[PDB]
Design a protein around this ligand. Sequence first.
Ligand SMILES: CCCCCCCCCCC(=O)OC[C@H](COP(=O)(O)OC[C@H](O)COP(=O)(O)OC[C@@H](COC(=O)CC)OC(=O)CCC)OC(=O)CCCCCCCC
Ligand SMILES: CCCCCCCCCCC(=O)OC[C@H](COP(=O)(O)OC[C@H](O)COP(=O)(O)OC[C@@H](COC(=O)CC)OC(=O)CCC)OC(=O)CCCCCCCC
Ligand code: HEM
Ligand code: HEM
Ligand SMILES: CCCCCCCCCCCCCCC(=O)OCCCOP(=O)(O)OC[C@@H](O)COP(=O)(O)OCCCOC(C)=O
Ligand SMILES: CCCCCCCCCCCCCCC(=O)O[C@H](COC(=O)CCCCCCCCCCCC)COP(=O)(O)O
Ligand SMILES: CCCCCCCCCCCCCCC(=O)O[C@H](COC(=O)CCCCCCCCCCCC)COP(=O)(O)O
Ligand SMILES: CCCCCCCCCCCCCCCCCC(=O)O[C@H](COC(=O)CCCCCC)COP(=O)(O)OCCN
Ligand SMILES: CCCCCCCCCCCCCCCCCC(=O)O[C@H](COC(=O)CCCCCC)COP(=O)(O)OCCN
Ligand SMILES: CCCCCCCCCCCO[C@@H]1O[C@H](CO)[C@@H](O[C@H]2O[C@H](CO)[C@@H](O)[C@H](O)[C@H]2O)[C@H](O)[C@H]1O
Lengths: 431, 352, 352, 55, 55, 126, 126
Amino acid sequence: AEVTQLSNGIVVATEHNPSAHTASVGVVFGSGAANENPYNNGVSNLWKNIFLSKENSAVAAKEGLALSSNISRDFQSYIVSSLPGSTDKSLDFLNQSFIQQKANLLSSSNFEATKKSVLKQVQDFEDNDHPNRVLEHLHSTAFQNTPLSLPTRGTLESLENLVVADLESFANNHFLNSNAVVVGTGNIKHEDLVNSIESKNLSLQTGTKPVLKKKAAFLGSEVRLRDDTLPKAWISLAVEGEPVNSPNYFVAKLAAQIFGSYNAFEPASRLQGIKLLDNIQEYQLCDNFNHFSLSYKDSGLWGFSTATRNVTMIDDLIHFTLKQWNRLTISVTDTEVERAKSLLKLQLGQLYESGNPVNDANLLGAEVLIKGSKLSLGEAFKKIDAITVKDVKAWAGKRLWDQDIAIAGTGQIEGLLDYMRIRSDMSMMRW
Amino acid sequence: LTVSARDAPTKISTLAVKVHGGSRYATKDGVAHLLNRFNFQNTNTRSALKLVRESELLGGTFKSTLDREYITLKATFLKDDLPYYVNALADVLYKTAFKPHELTESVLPAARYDYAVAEQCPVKSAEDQLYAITFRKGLGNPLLYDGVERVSLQDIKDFADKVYTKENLEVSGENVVEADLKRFVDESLLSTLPAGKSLVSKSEPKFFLGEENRVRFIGDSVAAIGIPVNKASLAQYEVLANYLTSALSELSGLISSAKLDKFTDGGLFTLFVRDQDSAVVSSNIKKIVADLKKGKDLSPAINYTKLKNAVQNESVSSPIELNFDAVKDFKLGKFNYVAVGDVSNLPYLDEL
Amino acid sequence: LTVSARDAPTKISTLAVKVHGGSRYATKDGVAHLLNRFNFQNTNTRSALKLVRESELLGGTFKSTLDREYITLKATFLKDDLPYYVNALADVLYKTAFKPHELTESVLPAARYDYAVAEQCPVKSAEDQLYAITFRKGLGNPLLYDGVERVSLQDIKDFADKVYTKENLEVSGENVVEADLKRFVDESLLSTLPAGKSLVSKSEPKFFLGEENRVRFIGDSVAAIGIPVNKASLAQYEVLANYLTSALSELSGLISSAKLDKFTDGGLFTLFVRDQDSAVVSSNIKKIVADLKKGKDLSPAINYTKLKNAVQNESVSSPIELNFDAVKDFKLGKFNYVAVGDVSNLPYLDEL
Amino acid sequence: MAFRKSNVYLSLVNSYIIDSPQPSSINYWWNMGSLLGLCLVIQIVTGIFMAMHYS
Amino acid sequence: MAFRKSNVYLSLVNSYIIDSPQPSSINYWWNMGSLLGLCLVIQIVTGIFMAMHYS
Amino acid sequence: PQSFTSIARIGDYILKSPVLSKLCVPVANQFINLAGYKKLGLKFDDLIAEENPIMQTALRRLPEDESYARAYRIIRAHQTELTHHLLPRNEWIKAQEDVPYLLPYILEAEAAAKEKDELDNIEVSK
Amino acid sequence: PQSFTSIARIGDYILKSPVLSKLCVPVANQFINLAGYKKLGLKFDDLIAEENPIMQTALRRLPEDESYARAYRIIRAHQTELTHHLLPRNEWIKAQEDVPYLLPYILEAEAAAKEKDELDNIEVSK
Ligand SMILES: CCCCCCCCCCC(=O)OC[C@H](COP(=O)(O)OC[C@H](O)COP(=O)(O)OC[C@@H](COC(=O)CC)OC(=O)CCC)OC(=O)CCCCCCCC
Ligand SMILES: CCCCCCCCCCC(=O)OC[C@H](COP(=O)(O)OC[C@H](O)COP(=O)(O)OC[C@@H](COC(=O)CC)OC(=O)CCC)OC(=O)CCCCCCCC
Ligand code: HEM
Ligand code: HEM
Ligand SMILES: CCCCCCCCCCCCCCC(=O)OCCCOP(=O)(O)OC[C@@H](O)COP(=O)(O)OCCCOC(C)=O
Ligand SMILES: CCCCCCCCCCCCCCC(=O)O[C@H](COC(=O)CCCCCCCCCCCC)COP(=O)(O)O
Ligand SMILES: CCCCCCCCCCCCCCC(=O)O[C@H](COC(=O)CCCCCCCCCCCC)COP(=O)(O)O
Ligand SMILES: CCCCCCCCCCCCCCCCCC(=O)O[C@H](COC(=O)CCCCCC)COP(=O)(O)OCCN
Ligand SMILES: CCCCCCCCCCCCCCCCCC(=O)O[C@H](COC(=O)CCCCCC)COP(=O)(O)OCCN
Ligand SMILES: CCCCCCCCCCCO[C@@H]1O[C@H](CO)[C@@H](O[C@H]2O[C@H](CO)[C@@H](O)[C@H](O)[C@H]2O)[C@H](O)[C@H]1O
């Protein structure tokens, strides 16, 4: 159990998994939505879709290859999956997609058709995916006029104004060697991959460095998208959280696990050791909720999202939740912290020990881009077990107690009270 | 009482107790679903509440899944806690309380939730329909409980007796040491369970062809075709499903979904065309059928399907298909058809 | 513009304006139902409220009825007030306001009610199904509006334009002096209506046989059979319907309902078996079909049918009268079948 | 629900002076009512205390 | 609805004194509360009228 | 209190009279501009007191698109009012946009209510 | 507010002891007969104050047929009380009929509630 990483101009990172019956090879760039501007916003999502374009997918399918691409805020990935014995065929495809060619996919017919498809996907997301649309607006308001505020899929306005030149322009500025990491996961040998890459010459294409921008900043604020025609109220609320590599990265995740997630329709979900559940189940304040600790390069967001049909009691839902958060600073119990440790280990285990090579490729690539390595699950578990009640209290005392919040909501949110009533609940009266 | 387990130096492990008690074996419409929902409720010695609270403390979660073939009780947890989870799953099969209040307060409401969700998805209704007209009683049984046929507490208990037997289940473990798993299973109440019969049928199921059923529904329209497939003919249908949903086929952009449901005694190929506009569904389905009837070469999709069939690593008792290296051509013969939605403006089987 | 009437020395008279705009002619699912519900709402010169208050003081009521073939506007009043009702009915066809608020506030809710009432009656569900699988698009159109196919205000107005024409309606009167009726009809706006074209098909409708549809439903189970009949075979199915429902048949206690729906271009014979117990429905339908395949002598039911057919008749537009004398035997050939309810435990067309 | 809403007495206080939905645009002229309540309290309290010494 | 239920003031009267659902079996001991209300009224009224002549 | 049927009757009479129209309309135009509701982004019909059956009937019948638009103007007007400012000149409602969008719904509701009252109190002359 | 779990624990201890049983049961029998609830057509379990979460859970779980019967006994008892009479002797609840039909539902709810409270306050000994 270990992760190897070598360099020679191109940084190669692999993670051999014997129990895997497939392999994934790809490139992860250290640039995402947070590297775009308001006007070209969605250009990365455009790249993802042309990579997954029918023409390109057909070539890959003929060789028994499957394509994957993920657009995030800090990173961007392009992965090719195949049987363990066809790892060579994956690299040949990857070489043709970035090095050998970089304008064949950008033909008028392919660009227009792809652009038309993403425009449809984004319009759909905006009209129908309320919980995710609300979470995207949380980022938009929390980090407004800052890089982290840009939605990963882009916006309809900027998307429809995008032309091939914008794609090429972005590719030239970000699809660079110094901003990339070739990853290999599943059944793969570090030596085989590093030698197959080193097999080809390609050395002249490099040297260039990506563009620099402004620093992400949190701003207490809110964006309300009331829609009385929707059957529920969907809201996300959060404070400034922890960036990746923060000394409190795990404490923040443990705190989120204390309140966790809930589904009113699942019998076992209603039996969880979460004190908040005693307050919200009596009058059934919501259908579901999920606490999170989103971490990025420059900042993060700690809070929760919830959906409810109880439109006349939203004030109680928010009040009880925030009152529980108050407890992290003054009265969180030893048992609550212990329960959270166990569940945090379980979530981390399921995230990192998945049987999916593409998931591992994304995780490996993203982590080696930020810290030049991937923290072992063993060392993560040890940090988690070391977290104390005092640690949680010190963290909440600086991050939660009487701190600004960002709020986003859509649907029947008339019952969601004004900003100050919510903001006041971030603390309690004391003597 | 089969026991298998693949090991790994991981920190997380999964345990699965697969019981041949899916909807195909349901004595009454929906009983398999209700039993699935009863799993993890109170046992004679431990309440559902204590199970959840205890499992959270040591770091583990439980779930019971229902499909046409099985009722799978799964546990995901920290590796070293294996014995606890083996006994927990065993206690469910051997001694669930089955209290009347649990049926009314938790089971029925949860099953209503599942139905309500599925009820709004026309493709799931179309799939249920496809199974019903192609197989009828048995494999064609409804997956979920919709209450058309009343199911009592006793019916649920009777089905548990009929399905929870040593000969009707397989224990599987991932990232688990087989030696220990076998030892723990032998010490658990699993071995104390009665050794009934394996409900698995060896012979091929009776099927029907050229069948059609139409269902009015408010929402998206769906036209679907179902084809019963032989045990030996299932490899060519697997490649067909992947081919039809890949960039290798010109009609992939016309189909919402296509797949092959595989069982030990055969399978069912299903293809769905879904859209809010009935005219679009009509044109798409007509084009798909006409194209498939003309036939096509599935050879180019061989290496691709091999990769896709392999991405199912989580499955332990997976049906091996070395038959891939023999598939080439496909020509659409007889099939079954179901229209759901704006039925008055959807094609009839006669027109295809 | 056919105008006929039968007089009598009574206090009460009835007036009907039969329009060939029933569900069989519905352009979109439920539009005939919606138009039927729109009748007697506001006209351009008189509100629905004034019409009601005015006719109450006079001593009369209005009603609009819908069936597979007609949309019938009927008035029942005190004899001497005939001209008022002639003009009232004429105003409806010529100048109903069709205000958007009337659709939302009165028409849609009223149609929603009609649907909910029928929705809980499985034989009516089975009957719609029988008409659907036998004739499809034409006479197979759903009787009521259920919302699967969106129907706008404009669609309703379009249907009115299509069906409210002089060549497409017949005016009837009972206990009314014909001479005066014709005069009032000519003076009314009924004569100013566009002389369109009769929608009545003179040829025989396309039909299907050996078709079946199964519908899951909570409540009583129902097994029904539908048989398309020619204009010539009409009389034999009339006596059959009455025979199977009379004390002359030893299977009348096994059937819930049996009838022959007569149209100018043919008809549909329907037989329904209904019960809360699906086992009873199964037994009965299987026996009914077995005995009908064995052949039956309908001769003894001839005089009974002449009596029953005579009582059923009242409208001045009844089908083929003298045709009964030649009926003799009957043997069930091909037919259509529908199962509604506990479908998983109901017979299939196969075993019939 | 919150105690201010469930309690029989506090629910009145809550409906009248805590959660009462007010039009966002009411101006300072809408402050006179609270002033009248204050006046009544001032009068009754000073009056009672003076009554103790009045003949 | 009836005015006694619709009107803002009458509704309270109706709620407490007219439509108030009473257990069918309460005996005469449950009449003391109304008597206490009567007593308070008697005291306040006689008191005020006497206050007019008191120093 | 004064019905819109009555306001229209008097108003139409002034409008259809070349003499009165030339004498009254200019005064009315200045009255409206001095009113200042358009400076808050409002149309006159947005100003009608709605707490009565006629107006509730009218507002319920108002098509969705216009209803959403009215909601926005009212909300924006409240926000502008509470800040003690007027909207920027370019956001003011133009005279061409100050249309009686609700009036026809109001007149229809009033006519129906008037007829119901008449029918409820009709006398029979035997 | 003494729990039924506590009551049963003490009572069972008395019933299981031949000495205490022969000494207490007779006095208890006399106490019950003097209580007179059976003369109003009531069973002891009908007398339990129900305005608490445990009792509401118990009553909700009580099977329908028994719930309807309990309802009748309560109504009939109120009617008899207001008329200041006792029921006819033949309608009195017989000793054999004075069964603890609700007790098992009550004990079950109390046990579950007790466990939840213990689990909500569990301490972890590392
Ligand atoms: C007199 C003996 C009885 C004593 C009782 C006194 C109680 C006060 C009565 C006065 C009153 O009700 O006036 C209301 C009138 C309406 O105002 P508006 O809602 O449109 O305000 C918008 C404001 O800028 C928001 O502004 P903001 O809230 O930010 O601060 C407002 C202002 C409020 O001052 C007051 O307390 C009221 C005068 O504070 C200041 O900036 C003052 C700096 C020293 O306020 C005004 O704007 C004044 C207009 C002339 C009224 C003259 C009074 C006739 C006698
Ligand atoms: C000085 C300050 C007090 C002055 C005002 C006090 C007035 C009321 C106080 C007495 C009281 O509340 O006693 C209630 C007690 C309960 O009775 P229950 O509900 O079980 O009745 C069934 C009844 O036959 C229904 O009978 P029914 O309604 O048909 O008529 C009842 C009777 C009522 O009389 C009264 O005024 C009430 C006491 O009318 C008559 O027929 C009497 C003919 C002269 O009635 C009794 O049986 C009295 C028990 C004596 C204890 C008194 C102790 C006081 C120190
Ligand atoms: C609605 C509230 C009240 C109003 C409007 C009111 C008004 C007045 C006025 C105008 C005077 C004459 C003040 C002067 O010129 O010296 C006065 C005097 C007095 N009031 Fe009140 N009053 C109120 C309530 C009360 C109450 C509740 C008491 C209780 C006994 C009270 C006790 C007195 C006394 C003792 C005086 C005489 C001393 C003095 O002149 O200030 N008042 N009140
Ligand atoms: C709950 C209400 C009241 C109670 C319990 C109460 C009680 C009493 C008592 C026990 C006395 C002495 C009676 C005696 O032995 O002579 C008294 C006297 C008096 N009370 Fe009250 N009282 C009440 C309300 C009032 C009110 C509201 C006033 C209004 C000012 C008032 C004015 C007087 C006066 C003037 C006297 C002196 C004359 C007398 O002795 O009767 N009382 N009260
Ligand atoms: C800015 C100022 C701040 C300074 C603070 C000092 C000012 C004090 C604030 C508290 C003011 C409350 C005054 C209103 C009041 O007591 O009347 C309540 C009438 C109840 O009527 P409702 O609002 O329709 O409520 C609901 C009730 O009608 C339902 O009936 P039920 O369940 O029987 O409950 C009934 C109340 C009964 O009491 C009365 C007398 O009404
Ligand atoms: C009879 C009625 C007449 C008066 C009408 C006017 C109403 C004014 C009442 C003021 C109550 C303010 C409470 C604030 C609160 O609870 O928020 C508390 C905070 O309170 C404070 O910080 C103290 C502010 C000082 C209050 C000044 C007292 C006013 C002097 C009395 C004048 C009236 C005689 C919750 O605060 P948080 O939202 O940040 O968590
Ligand atoms: C604050 C004081 C507390 C006292 C509580 C006592 C409550 C009794 C109040 C009596 C109101 C009766 C109203 C009946 C009614 O409206 O029904 C009216 C009929 O009223 C009558 O016939 C008159 C009855 C005369 C009762 C005398 C009143 C006694 C005054 C002394 C009470 C001092 C407190 C409707 O009757 P109907 O239902 O047959 O159509
Ligand atoms: C002219 C005035 C007429 C009065 C109009 C009524 C206006 C109400 C305004 C009063 C504000 C004061 C409320 C404080 C009390 C709230 C706490 C409470 O009710 O706790 C109570 C207990 O209260 C007591 O024991 C004494 C209350 C005496 C209050 C005397 C001022 C708890 O009540 P709980 O809601 O928890 O329900 C109990 C479970 N069955
Ligand atoms: C602690 C203080 C006392 C607590 C207050 C609550 C108890 C109130 C009991 C008083 C009984 C008296 C009620 C009579 C008033 C009912 C009629 C009414 O409200 O008509 C009112 C008009 O009232 C007035 O103009 C003056 C009322 C002054 C009353 C002075 C005592 C009509 O109101 P309306 O309900 O018809 O509103 C129309 C809804 N479409
Ligand atoms: C009405 C007659 C006159 C009475 C006297 C006036 C009353 C004054 C009360 C003053 C302060 O009461 C005090 O208020 C502050 C908020 O301002 C509370 O603070 C609370 O919220 C603030 C945020 O706004 C947090 O920073 C703080 O950590 C938290 O404890 C504090 O815990 C409470 O103790």
